[PDB]
Scaffold this active site. Structure first.
Site, PDB file in Angstrom:
ATOM      1  N   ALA C  99       0.861  -1.164  -0.053  1.00 34.17           N
ATOM      2  CA  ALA C  99      -0.164  -0.074  -0.058  1.00 34.17           C
ATOM      3  C   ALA C  99       0.753   1.109   0.027  1.00 34.17           C
ATOM      4  O   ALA C  99       0.250   2.301   0.040  1.00 34.17           O
ATOM      5  CB  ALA C  99      -1.054  -0.026   1.388  1.00 34.17           C
ATOM      6  N   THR C 179       8.778   4.999   9.169  1.00 34.02           N
ATOM      7  CA  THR C 179       9.153   4.922   7.971  1.00 34.02           C
ATOM      8  C   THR C 179       8.433   5.885   6.881  1.00 34.02           C
ATOM      9  O   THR C 179       8.827   5.915   5.636  1.00 34.02           O
ATOM     10  CB  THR C 179       8.634   3.345   7.473  1.00 34.02           C
ATOM     11  OG1 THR C 179       7.231   3.047   7.648  1.00 34.02           O
ATOM     12  CG2 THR C 179       9.363   2.211   8.191  1.00 34.02           C
ATOM     13  N   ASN C 206       5.056   3.065  20.140  1.00 34.18           N
ATOM     14  CA  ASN C 206       6.437   2.580  19.934  1.00 34.18           C
ATOM     15  C   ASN C 206       7.577   3.471  20.387  1.00 34.18           C
ATOM     16  O   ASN C 206       8.420   2.943  20.982  1.00 34.18           O
ATOM     17  CB  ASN C 206       6.768   2.675  18.315  1.00 34.18           C
ATOM     18  CG  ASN C 206       6.612   1.310  17.750  1.00 34.18           C
ATOM     19  OD1 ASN C 206       6.399   0.302  18.182  1.00 34.18           O
ATOM     20  ND2 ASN C 206       6.780   1.344  16.440  1.00 34.18           N
ATOM     21  N   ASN C 228       9.478  -5.868  19.767  1.00 34.74           N
ATOM     22  CA  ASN C 228       8.512  -7.039  19.620  1.00 34.74           C
ATOM     23  C   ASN C 228       8.333  -7.988  20.623  1.00 34.74           C
ATOM     24  O   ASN C 228       7.267  -8.504  20.876  1.00 34.74           O
ATOM     25  CB  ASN C 228       8.285  -7.748  18.390  1.00 34.74           C
ATOM     26  CG  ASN C 228       8.203  -6.744  17.090  1.00 34.74           C
ATOM     27  OD1 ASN C 228       7.544  -5.580  17.534  1.00 34.74           O
ATOM     28  ND2 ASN C 228       8.328  -7.085  15.832  1.00 34.74           N
ATOM     29  N   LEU C 252     -14.322 -12.096  25.977  1.00 38.08           N
ATOM     30  CA  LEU C 252     -14.408 -10.518  25.263  1.00 38.08           C
ATOM     31  C   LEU C 252     -15.393  -9.540  25.643  1.00 38.08           C
ATOM     32  O   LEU C 252     -14.837  -8.502  25.963  1.00 38.08           O
ATOM     33  CB  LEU C 252     -14.223 -10.962  23.943  1.00 38.08           C
ATOM     34  CG  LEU C 252     -13.046 -11.591  23.257  1.00 38.08           C
ATOM     35  CD1 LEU C 252     -13.134 -11.512  21.448  1.00 38.08           C
ATOM     36  CD2 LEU C 252     -11.978 -10.818  23.461  1.00 38.08           C
ATOM     37  N   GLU C 254     -16.485  -9.456  28.618  1.00 38.20           N
ATOM     38  CA  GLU C 254     -16.173  -8.941  30.100  1.00 38.20           C
ATOM     39  C   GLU C 254     -14.890  -7.558  29.931  1.00 38.20           C
ATOM     40  O   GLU C 254     -14.986  -6.720  30.697  1.00 38.20           O
ATOM     41  CB  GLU C 254     -15.627  -9.859  30.823  1.00 38.20           C
ATOM     42  CG  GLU C 254     -15.843  -9.650  32.425  1.00 38.20           C
ATOM     43  CD  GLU C 254     -15.226 -10.586  33.080  1.00 38.20           C
ATOM     44  OE1 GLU C 254     -14.884 -11.795  32.898  1.00 38.20           O
ATOM     45  OE2 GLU C 254     -14.623 -10.215  34.334  1.00 38.20           O
TER      46      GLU C 254
END
Ligand code: GTP
Ligand code: GDP
Ligand code: CA
Ligand code: MG
Lengths: 155, 431, 437
Positions: C99, C179, C206, C228, C252, C254
Site C-alpha cells: 500500500a 518509515t 512505539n 516486539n 471478550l 467482559e
C-alpha cells in the site's frame, strides 16, 4: 528588389551572393519587417566575412531594430567573439541600450560568454548600467552566484 | 515492487547511463560477461530490481539504449560493459537531432519512438511486478530532451500506474557554450513537471564548479564530471538495490519526498568528493560525513540550500558505522539548522544505513533534498531563456519543424509558475 | 470455552503476531510442530487453551489465526521460520504489491483486490468454532496496509459477524522508527473509520516501548526484534485471562464491561512491571507492593501520557506468579491512600484484581530476566487523550498546507474524508474533556 535578397544572403552566409547584390545597387541598409539589417543578421548567424564586407560598403554599425537591438547586442548575446571585436573596431557603441534596458555587457554576462565580457570591459562598457529592473551586470552575477563572472567584473 | 526498466537516451544519457551500469555491476559482483563473481549474499538479494536472469546463470541489465545518432551506439559497445547489453535493446536512428528539441520531439524523434515502445513492452511484460521506469538524459540537447520527454509521455499513458523517474542533467555555459540549450531545457522542464513523479536535477554548472574550485582540476573533462554523476546515481539508488525498509521502492520514496505533485525536483548531494585519482583518502567520521552532506559545496545542483527551506530530506549512510551515532548526528544537524526546515512537515528527515560502501571508500553519505532553494537553478535557466527569446533568436529552427511559437511562451510561463510555487512554500509558516 | 480468532495485518501486525504465538506455545507447552504432550484429550477438547488453538485428529494444535499482508516479504519469513509447521498454510495470505504507506491504497485500490479472499479464509476458521466470541486484530497505525486494509476489514467483519466482539492491538507511531512522513494521516484516517466497529483497542506507543528498552534493558539502539519481544510479553499478559482459568476478563464481552464505560472512549492504557534486563539474572525479587506501585509510574506505561493529569474510569490489575491475595489488598490500600489517584465521580472507586499463580514465561533469546511475580495494569484514564492530541497536532500542521493530500485523492479517496476524520477526532478529544473535569 535586391534588398530582400541581400537580407537572405547575409543570414545564410552566401559571401559571393552578397558581393554580387551590392555591385547591382542592393541597399546594404535594407531592413526586414522588424528593422533587422543585413549586418544584424550576419552578426547573429556568425558570418564574420560578411560582417567585414558590409562594413566596408556603408553599413551603419549602430543600426537598431524595432526593439532597439544593435548588431553588437546580438553578437554579444549569441557569443561571436571575433565579430564583437570587428564591430568595436568600426565604432560600435559599447553602451547601447535596447528596449529592455540591456547593454551588450548585460547580455554577454547572462549567457556566460566570459571572454566577451572581458573585451567589452576593456572597451569601456559601463558596469553601472542598470536594465529596466535595476540590475547591473554585477547584480546579475551576484544573484546567479556566478563567481567566475563576478571576479571578472572586479578586475 | 521489484523490477525497474532503465532507458538511456541521447549522448549524455547513454554516457552517464553506461557509467551507471559499470559502477553498480561492480557493487553487485557482476563481471562484464554477466557472471556473478561476488562474495556477499547481500549483492544478490535484490539483483532482480535492475538485472534479468538469463540462460546460464547470467545477469543482463534491464536496459534500453536509444539515440537518433548511430555513432553513440558503437561507442557504447566499445565500453567495458558494452557487451553485456542485449543486442535487441539498441534502438538507433539515422542522423542526430542537431541540438534541436523540435526534431527530437516532433519529427525525427517521433518516427523512431514506436520502435522504442516495442522494446519497452517486451521488457515490461517480462517483469513479475514492475515498479516503473528510470531515464537518463540531458535537457540541453535535442534527442535526450526532445525525444526523451516524448518517450516519457508515451510510456506514461501505457503504464499510468507505474512510477516515472529521471536523472536529468541541466545545461551550463561553463561546460557547453551552445546558446539554444536554454530553449531545449525550458521546453523539457515544462514536460517534466507534468509527466514524471521524481526527477534528480544533476546540474552541469555544479559539476564543473566542484571539479574546478574544489577538486582543483584546471580543465575538467566529461569523464571528470561523469565521475561525480556515477557516484551520485549509485548513492541515490542504494535503498532500491539492497535490503532495507525505508524508501525501499520508487513509490514509497515518492510519497515520502513529494508533498505537492509539481514539486518533485530533487537536489542530490554526496560526501566525500573524489577526483578519479583520490590517492589514500582517509575515512571520514560520522559527524564529518553529516556536515559535508548538507554543505552547498557538496550539492549536485548549483543552489545554496541555506537560501531556502527543506521540505523533505532522505539521507543514506553507507559502510560500517554506529547506528546510534548516525541518529545523534542527524538529530543534531536538524537542531543546529532548524530554520532551514519547514516546521509544518514534522519528522521530514528520514535516514537509511546500508552496510556495503561504494568502491574505494569505507564511509560515504548521500543526500536527497526537496528544497525550495532549487528555484535558483530554474531562475538561472529562465533568465537565459528570456534573453534569447526576447530577441527571437533562432526561433525558426524550431517553428520550421512544426512547433508553434506559443509553445515557447507556455513553457516559459510554466517555469515561472514553478518558481513562484517554491517561493510560496519557502515563505509559509505554521503560525 | 468460546473461540477467539486472531488477525494480523501488515508488517507490524505480522511480526508482532509471530512473537506472540511463539510465546503462547511456550506458555502452553506446545512444540513448534503443534504437538502438546500434556494434552490428554487427543483430537479435541474443551480446555481453556482451546480458545486460541484448535486440534486435528493427529494431535496437532493449530493457532486460530490469519496473517494478511499486501506484499509477501514478511509473511514469507513466517513460512520458512522455526514455527513454519504451526500455522494453517492457507491462513497465510499475501498479495504482490503493498500500500506504499498510503491509507487510500490499503482501503480502496490495492486492498479491494484481496478482501474477499481474506473473508472467505476467515469464514473457514469461523465454521470450525462451536461458539466464536470474536476477533483480535493486530495492525500498525502508520502503514498503508495496517491502517487502510484494517479498516476495510473491520467494516466487512461488522457486516458478516454483527454480534461478535472485535478488539484491536494498534501500533501508534514514533519518529525513532517511523518509515513514512504521512503516518499521522494514516493514523487519523484509520481511527475515524474503525471507531464504530471496534469494541476495545489497546494502543502500543512505539516510543514508550523504545524508551523502556533503552532505560530498563540497556539496549543502546533497539530494533523491531527488541520492541516486539517486549510487546508480546505485554500482549500475553492481557490475553492470559482468555487462555487460562481465572475470574477476571474471562471473555471478550467482559473486557468491554470492565474497561469501556462508553463505546467511543474504548482505549485502555496498559502498564507492566517489572521489566528487568537478562544481564541481571541475580536481581533481588521485587515484592507485590513494589510492582504494584510501579504501575503508577509513567515510565512503565505502553503509551506516553501522564495519568496524574487525568481521571480514572476503570482499573484492573492482573498478576502472574507468586502473589498472595492479602498482599495485593494491603498494597492497594496503601496506594488508595498515599498516592493521588482520582476516579470520576460516577464510577465505583475500586480496583478489580485477577491472579494467575504461574510466573511469566521468558523466550530464549529474549532481553528479559525471569521473575517470580509480575503485574499488568489495565486502566481507562482520560490522560490517554494526550496521545490523540499529539497526533492531531501533527495532522493539522500538514493538512493546513494540504501536504501529501494528492497521494490519497489519486488513489480513490475524496478530500472531504480528511475533514470528516479530523472532526471526529476533535469530538473524541471533547469526549475525554467532558468526562474529566
Ligand atoms: N513495534 C513494531 N512496529 C513496527 C513493526 N514493523 C513496522 N512497525 C511500525 O509500523 C509503522 C509502519 O507500518 P507497517 O506495518 O510497516 O506498514 P504495512 O502495514 O505493512 O503497510 P504498507 O507496507 O504501507 O503496505 C511504522 O510506524 C513502524 O514503526 C514491528 O515489527 N514492530
Ligand atoms: N555531465 C555530462 N553532460 C553531458 C555529457 N554529454 C553531453 N552532455 C551535456 O548535454 C548537453 C547536450 O546534450 P546531448 O546529450 O549531447 O544531445 P543529445 O544527443 O541530442 O541528447 C550539453 O549541455 C552537454 O554539456 C556527459 O557525458 N556528461
Ligand atoms: Ca485436547
Ligand atoms: Mg508493508
Amino acid at each position: 528588389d535586391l534588398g530582400k535578397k541581400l537580407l537572405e544572403a547575409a543570414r545564410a552566409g552566401q559571401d559571393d551572393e552578397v558581393r554580387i547584390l551590392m555591385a547591382n545597387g542592393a541597399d546594404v541598409n535594407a531592413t526586414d519587417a522588424s528593422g533587422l539589417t543585413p549586418l544584424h543578421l550576419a552578426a547573429t548567424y556568425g558570418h564574420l566575412e560578411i560582417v567585414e564586407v558590409l562594413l566596408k560598403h556603408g553599413a551603419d554599425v549602430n543600426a537598431i531594430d524595432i526593439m532597439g537591438s544593435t548588431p553588437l547586442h546580438l553578437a554579444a548575446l549569441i557569443g561571436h567573439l571575433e565579430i564583437v571585436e570587428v564591430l568595436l573596431k568600426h565604432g560600435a557603441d559599447v553602451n547601447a541600450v535596447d528596449t529592455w534596458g540591456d547593454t551588450p555587457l548585460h547580455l554577454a554576462a547572462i549567457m556566460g560568454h566570459l571572454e566577451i565580457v572581458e573585451v567589452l570591459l576593456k572597451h569601456g562598457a559601463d558596469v553601472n548600467a542598470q536594465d529596466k529592473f535595476g540590475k547591473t551586470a554585477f547584480d546579475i552575477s551576484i544573484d546567479n552566484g556566478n563567481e567566475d563572472l563576478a571576479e571578472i567584473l572586479q578586475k | 515492487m521489484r523490477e525497474i526498466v532503465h532507458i538511456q537516451a541521447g549522448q549524455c544519457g547513454n554516457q552517464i547511463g553506461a557509467k551507471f551500469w559499470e559502477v553498480i555491476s561492480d557493487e553487485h559482483g557482476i563481471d562484464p560477461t554477466g557472471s556473478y563473481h561476488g562474495d556477499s549474499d547481500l549483492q544478490l538479494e535484490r539483483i532482480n530490481v535492475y538485472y534479468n536472469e538469463a540462460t546460464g546463470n547470467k545477469y543482463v541489465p534491464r536496459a534500453i539504449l536509444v539515440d537518433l545518432e548511430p555513432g553513440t551506439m558503437d561507442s557504447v559497445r566499445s565500453g567495458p560493459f558494452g557487451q553485456i547489453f542485449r543486442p535487441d535493446n539498441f534502438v538507433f536512428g539515422q542522423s542526430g537531432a542537431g541540438n534541436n528539441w523540435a526534431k527530437g520531439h516532433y519529427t525525427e524523434g517521433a518516427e523512431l519512438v514506436d520502435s522504442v515502445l516495442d522494446v519497452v513492452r517486451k521488457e515490461s511484460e517480462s517483469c513479475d511486478c514492475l515498479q516503473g521506469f528510470q531515464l537518463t538524459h540531458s535537457l540541453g540537447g535535442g534527442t535526450g530532451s526532445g525525444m526523451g520527454t516524448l518517450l516519457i509521455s508515451k510510456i506514461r499513458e501505457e503504464y499510468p500506474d507505474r512510477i516515472m523517474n529521471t536523472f536529468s542533467v541541466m545545461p551550463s555555459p561553463k561546460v557547453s557554450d551552445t546558446v539554444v540549450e536554454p530553449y531545449n531545457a525550458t521546453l523539457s522542464v515544462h514536460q517534466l513537471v507534468e509527466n514524471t513523479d521524481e526527477t534528480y536535477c544533476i546540474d552541469n554548472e555544479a559539476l564543473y564548479d566542484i571539479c574546478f574550485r574544489t577538486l582543483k582540476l584546471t580543465t575538467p573533462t566529461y569523464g571528470d564530471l561523469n565521475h561525480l554523476v556515477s557516484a551520485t546515481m549509485s548513492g541515490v539508488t542504494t535503498c532500491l538495490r539492497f535490503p532495507g525498509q525505508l524508501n525501499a521502492d520508487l513509490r514509497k520514496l515518492a510519497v515520502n519526498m513529494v508533498p505537492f505533485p509539481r514539486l518533485h525536483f530533487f537536489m542530490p548531494g554526496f560526501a566525500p568528493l573524489t577526483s578519479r585519482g583520490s590517492q589514500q583518502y582517509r575515512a571520514l567520521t560520522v559527524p564529518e560525513l553529516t556536515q559535508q552532506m548538507f554543505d552547498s559545496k557538496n550539492m549536485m545542483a548549483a543552489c545554496d540550500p541555506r537560501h531556502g527551506r527543506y521540505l523533505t530530506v532522505a539521507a543514506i549512510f553507507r559502510g560500517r558505522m554506529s547506528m546510534k551515532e548516525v541518529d545523534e548526528q542527524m538529530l543534531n544537524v536538524q537542531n543546529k539548522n532548524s530554520s532551514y526546515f519547514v516546521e509544518w512537515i514534522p519528522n521530514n528527515v528520514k535516514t537509511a544505513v546500508c552496510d556495503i560502501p561504494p568502491r574505494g571508500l569505507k564511509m560515504s553519505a548521500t543526500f536527497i533534498g526537496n528544497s525550495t532553494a532549487i528555484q535558483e537553478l530554474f531562475k538561472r535557466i529562465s533568465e537565459q531563456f528570456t534573453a534569447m527569446f526576447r530577441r527571437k533568436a533562432f526561433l525558426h529552427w524550431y517553428t520550421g519543424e512544426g512547433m508553434d511559437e506559443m509553445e515557447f511562451t507556455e513553457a516559459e510561463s510554466n517555469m515561472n509558475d514553478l518558481v513562484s510555487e517554491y517561493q510560496q512554500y519557502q515563505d509559509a509558516t505554521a503560525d | 470455552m468460546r473461540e477467539c480468532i486472531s488477525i494480523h495485518v501488515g508488517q507490524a501486525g505480522v511480526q508482532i503476531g509471530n512473537a506472540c504465538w511463539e510465546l503462547y506455545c511456550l506458555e502452553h507447552g506446545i512444540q513448534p510442530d503443534g504437538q502438546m504432550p500434556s494434552d490428554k484429550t487427543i483430537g479435541g477438547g474443551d480446555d481453556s487453551f482451546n480458545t486460541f488453538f484448535s486440534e486435528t485428529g493427529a494431535g496437532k494444535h493449530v493457532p486460530r489465526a490469519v496473517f494478511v499482508d499486501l506484499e509477501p516479504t514478511v509473511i514469507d519469513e513466517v513460512r520458512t521460520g522455526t514455527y513454519r509447521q504451526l500455522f494453517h498454510p492457507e491462513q497465510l495470505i499475501t498479495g504482490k504489491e503493498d500500500a506504499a504507506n498510503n491509507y487510500a491504497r490499503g482501503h480502496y485500490t490495492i486492498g479491494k483486490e484481496i478482501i474477499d479472499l481474506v473473508l472467505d479464509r476467515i469464514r473457514k476458521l469461523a465454521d470450525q468454532c462451536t461458539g466464536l466470541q470474536g476477533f483480535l486484530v493486530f495492525h500498525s497505525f502508520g502503514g498503508g496496509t495496517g491502517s487502510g486494509f484494517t479498516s476495510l476489514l473491520m467494516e466487512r467483519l461488522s457486516v458478516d459477524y454483527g454480534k461478535k466482539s472485535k478488539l484491536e492491538f494498534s501500533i501508534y507511531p514514533a519518529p525513532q522508527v517511523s518509515t513514512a512522513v504521512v503516518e499521522p494521516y494514516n493514523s487519523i484516517l484509520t481511527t475515524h473509520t474503525t471507531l464504530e466497529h471496534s469494541d476495545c483497542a489497546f494502543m502500543v506507543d512505539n516510543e514508550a516501548i523504545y524508551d523502556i528498552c533503552r532505560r530498563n534493558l540497556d539496549i543502546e539502539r533497539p530494533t523491531y526484534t527488541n520492541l516486539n519481544r517486549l510487546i508480546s510479553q505485554i500482549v500475553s499478559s492481557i490475553t492470559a485471562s482468555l487462555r487460562f482459568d481465572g475470574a477476571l476478563n474471562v471473555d471478550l464481552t467482559e473486557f468491554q464491561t470492565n474497561l469501556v464505560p462508553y463505546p467511543r472512549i474504548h482505549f485502555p492504557l496498559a502498564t507492566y512491571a517489572p521489566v528487568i534486563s537478562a544481564e541481571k539474572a541475580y536481581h533481588e525479587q521485587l515484592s507485590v507492593a513494589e510492582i504494584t506501585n510501579a504501575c503508577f509510574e509513567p515510565a512503565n506505561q505502553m503509551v506516553k501520557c501522564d495519568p496524574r493529569h487525568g481521571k480514572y474510569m476503570a482499573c484492573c490489575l492482573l498478576y502472574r506468579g507468586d502473589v498472595v491475595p492479602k498482599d495485593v489488598n494491603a498494597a492497594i490500600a496503601t496506594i488508595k491512600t498515599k498516592r493521588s489517584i482520582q476516579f470520576v465521580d460516577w464510577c465505583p472507586t475500586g480496583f478489580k484484581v485477577g491472579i494467575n499463580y504461574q510466573p511469566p514465561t521468558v523466550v530464549p533469546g529474549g532481553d528479559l530476566a525471569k521473575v517470580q511475580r509480575a503485574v499488568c495494569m489495565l486502566s481507562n484514564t482520560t490522560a490517554i487523550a494526550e496521545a490523540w492530541a499529539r497526533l492531531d497536532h501533527k495532522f493539522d500542521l500538514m493538512y493546513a498546507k494540504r501536504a501529501f493530500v494528492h497521494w490519497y485523492v489519486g488513489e480513490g479517496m475524496e478530500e472531504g474524508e480528511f475533514s470528516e476524520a479530523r472532526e471526529d477526532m476533535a469530538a473524541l478529544e471533547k469526549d475525554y474533556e467532558e468526562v474529566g473535569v
